[PDB]
């Protein structure tokens, strides 16, 4: 429902950045960097949900989803 209070603690909004390599072909995999965006304490053992990586032209060039590795 539109009018409701959700107060989550296990979810963080993040920005994912990656490099599109030369001569990249569909189906190949690349590394991504996940950075928190607002008042999150940690991203220790989180899992990145399906994220479309846009280019400068605002077109989806990659789809990101995986487990984050934080140093510790």
């Amino acid at each position: 429902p539109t009018g409701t209070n959700m107060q989550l603690k296990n979810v963080a909004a993040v920005m994912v950045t990656a490099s599109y390599p030369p001569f990249a072909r569909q189906g190949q995999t690349i590394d991504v960097v996940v950075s928190s965006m607002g008042n999150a304490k940690s991203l220790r053992g989180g899992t990145l949900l399906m994220t479309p990586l846009k280019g400068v032209d605002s077109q989806v060039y990659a789809l990101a989803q995986g487990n984050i590795l934080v140093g510790g």
Binding site: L49, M50, T51, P52, V60
Partner: protein
Amino acid sequence: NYGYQPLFEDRRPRNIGDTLTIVLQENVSASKSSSANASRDGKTSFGFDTVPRYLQGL
């Protein structure tokens, strides 16, 4: 099959046939007014109620 559907992007119309809600809220109010006026009043009088004898010819 409906094609790629994003997961965190807001539900927006993207293609032909997609529906969108319009909140009609129009409030236009224009006005103008103007005026102009002019007036002019004049009185003149001269009365020699008792004319002295040396001035009765003039």
